[PDB]
Amino acid sequence: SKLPTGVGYDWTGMSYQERLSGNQAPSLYAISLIVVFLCLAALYESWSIP
Amino acid sequence: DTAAAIRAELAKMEPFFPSGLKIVYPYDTTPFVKISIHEVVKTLVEAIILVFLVMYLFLQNFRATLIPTIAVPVVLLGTFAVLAAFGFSINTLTMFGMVLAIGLLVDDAIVVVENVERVMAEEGLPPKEATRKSMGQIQGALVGIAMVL
Amino acid sequence: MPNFFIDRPIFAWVIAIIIMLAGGLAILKLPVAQYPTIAPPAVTISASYP
Amino acid sequence: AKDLMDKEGKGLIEATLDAVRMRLRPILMTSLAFILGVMPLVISTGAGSGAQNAVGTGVMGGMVTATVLAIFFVPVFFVVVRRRFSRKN
Amino acid sequence: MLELLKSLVFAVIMVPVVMAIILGLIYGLGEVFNIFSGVGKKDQPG
Amino acid sequence: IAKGDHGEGKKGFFGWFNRMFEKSTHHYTDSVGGILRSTGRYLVLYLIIV
Ligand SMILES: CCCCCCCCCCCCO[C@@H]1O[C@H](CO)[C@@H](O[C@H]2O[C@H](CO)[C@@H](O)[C@H](O)[C@H]2O)[C@H](O)[C@H]1O
Ligand code: NI
Numbered sequence: 001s002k003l004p005t006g007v008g009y010d011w012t013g014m015s016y017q018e019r020l021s022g023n024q025a026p027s028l029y030a031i032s033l034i035v036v037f038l039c040l041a042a043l044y045e046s047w048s049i050p
Numbered sequence: 051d052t053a054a055a056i057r058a059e060l061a062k063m064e065p066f067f068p069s070g071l072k073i074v075y076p077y078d079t080t081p082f083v084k085i086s087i088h089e090v091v092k093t094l095v096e097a098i099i100l101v102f103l104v105m106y107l108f109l110q111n112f113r114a115t116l117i118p119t120i121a122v123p124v125v126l127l128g129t130f131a132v133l134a135a136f137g138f139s140i141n142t143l144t145m146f147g148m149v150l151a152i153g154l155l156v157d158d159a160i161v162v163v164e165n166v167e168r169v170m171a172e173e174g175l176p177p178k179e180a181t182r183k184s185m186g187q188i189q190g191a192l193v194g195i196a197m198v199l
Numbered sequence: 200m201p202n203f204f205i206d207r208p209i210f211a212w213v214i215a216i217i218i219m220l221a222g223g224l225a226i227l228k229l230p231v232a233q234y235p236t237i238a239p240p241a242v243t244i245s246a247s248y249p
Numbered sequence: 250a251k252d253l254m255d256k257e258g259k260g261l262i263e264a265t266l267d268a269v270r271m272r273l274r275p276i277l278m279t280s281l282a283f284i285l286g287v288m289p290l291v292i293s294t295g296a297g298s299g300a301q302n303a304v305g306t307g308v309m310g311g312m313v314t315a316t317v318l319a320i321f322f323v324p325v326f327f328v329v330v331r332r333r334f335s336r337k338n
Numbered sequence: 339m340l341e342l343l344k345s346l347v348f349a350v351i352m353v354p355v356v357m358a359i360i361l362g363l364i365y366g367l368g369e370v371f372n373i374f375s376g377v378g379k380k381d382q383p384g
Numbered sequence: 385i386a387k388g389d390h391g392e393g394k395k396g397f398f399g400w401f402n403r404m405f406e407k408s409t410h411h412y413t414d415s416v417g418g419i420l421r422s423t424g425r426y427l428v429l430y431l432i433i434v
Contacts, residue, residue: 006066035220042213051230082297083233089296093289096345100285103353108278110391110398124215127222134225142233146300150308153286157279164275174387178205185201187252262420270413274405281357288352317363321371324416325426332423333379361408368415375418376425 053080086142090149097149098122101156109167121159126152154199162188250327261331265324273320280316284309 011019040050060073098119105115129148130140138144165188170180204211250268253259259267290305391402419426 008062008066010062031220035217038213038216042210045207045209047209051232079233083231085296086233087231089293089298089301092341093293093301096289096342096349097286099345100288100349100353101282103349104278104282104285104357107353107357107401108274110394110402124218127225128218129222130225130229131218131221134229139230139232139235140226141231141235142300143235146304149287149290149301150304153283153308156282156286160278160282161275164278168271168274170385171390172388174385182202182205185205189201265420266413266417269416270409273409273412277357277360281353281360284356284360285353288348313360313363317360317367320364320412321367321416321419322426322430324420325423325430328420329379329423329427333383361405364412365408368411371419372415374425376422378422379424379427 053078083142087140087145090145093149094126094152097152105160109164114163114167117163118156118159122152122156125155125158158192162192261328265328269320269324276316276320280312284312287312 037050041047044050064073101122102115102119105118106112109115126148129151133144162184166177166181166184169175169184170177173180175183250261250265253264253268254261257264287305287308290301291309293301293305390406392399392406394402
């Protein structure tokens with residue numbers, strides 16, 4: 001940002017990719033954790049037993 | 051999505067514009083569609099309200115009215131799932147179609163919730179015994195109404 | 200068919216919720232656009248002799 | 250009415266009357282729920298209201314006449330399809 | 339959110355109004371269907 | 385709930401409603417009695433609206 005005007009930037013390749021997402025693990029392990037909290041009870045038929 | 055890409059493609063440009071030069075959007079289809087879906091979503095919510103009012107006004111109990119209310123969202127979003135799996139989009143037409151869908155579907159729920167109510171109101175048997183009995187006299191109707199429809 | 204669920208109250212909740220996540224995901228993943236394409240696709244050749 | 254016919258011991262007329270009397274309310278619950286479900290679309294204006302009006306005023310008129318009027322006529326159809334052409338044996 | 343208050347007021351007011359009308363319609367129709375109660379069918383199918 | 389009660393003995397507006405509804409019901413039923421004695425004209429009035 002501290003360079004002459006008219007100069008800008010962009011990321012490519014690996015850099016470009018890491019932009020889309022690098023870490024979704026905490027989201028999809030979270031949904032893993034809820035679909036697990038409930039799918040077990042789909043047999044234990046129990047509150048909190050899972 | 052294309053327009054969404056176009057504001058992106060273009061959002062990177064302004065910092066290197068010369069002095070005095072500014073963008074402007076004289077013809078734009080999108081906010082029509084943002085609004086078209088805003089309006090239907092709001093009709094849907096207020097419909098869910100109105101259903102819950104006719105439910106209270108008829109079963110006269112806070113508890114009873116939770117049942118058919120909960121069952122509607124499950125149906126309607128459930129539809130996104132299945133029409134996603136047939137390659138259909140959440141468009142003007144489709145999204146608009148499901149309001150009618152909400153309308154039809156609500157009673158699929160209530161006919162049975164009610165029928166159980168009315169059955170327990172004379173032989174006076176618990177919710178289990180009554181709802182089971184209720185399934186016995188109707189459940190067969192529900193598949194066929196659905197088939198013929 | 201229904202009775203099975205009458206005895207098994209939660210498992211229904213599991214069916215419903217799985218459908219709740221399926222649909223709630225199905226918005227976030229599906230394309231949003233006014234019009235499902237409705238015209239004969241057409242290609243257009245274009246020339247210019249000055 | 251049919252269930253009262255076979256699964257219980259009944260002829261048509263009295264069966265119909267009991268079905269229709271037991272069944273009357275639900276019809277209104279549904280139709281009131283429904284007609285009111287669609288309320289916004291018919292009342293709606295602006296914001297590209299062309300569609301939801303055309304859909305709602307279509308389903309509404311057809312919802313009243315299919316309720317206020319059909320609860321009277323259904324019984325006659327179900328009787329006439331039997332009373333005038335049934336298995337006497 | 340504010341449109342929701344509008345929704346609630348229309349809702350509460352309207353639920354009875356429409357309700358009455360549809361009952362009014364069967365109540366009325368019932369009376370006119372009472373007046374005009376017909377003789378029966380014809381013997382041709384038999 | 386009780387066996388046989390249709391909520392008439394209930395506090396407030398709600399009872400009024402249940403009574404006038406149950407009334408609307410008797411009316412309607414006693415009216416379908418009349419209609420059902422008169423199968424024919426109805427079949428052909430049905431024709432006029434068809
Ligand atoms: C899995 C994909 C396929 C889905 C479609 C499968 C069809 C069967 C659905 C399972 C539900 C049971 O389906 C069952 O069918 C028979 C067929 O008359 C009905 O048996 C019948 O009972 C009495 C008279 O016999 C009447 O109410 C009615 O004539 C009919 O329902 C049951 O009431 C219905 O519950
Ligand atoms: Ni009487």
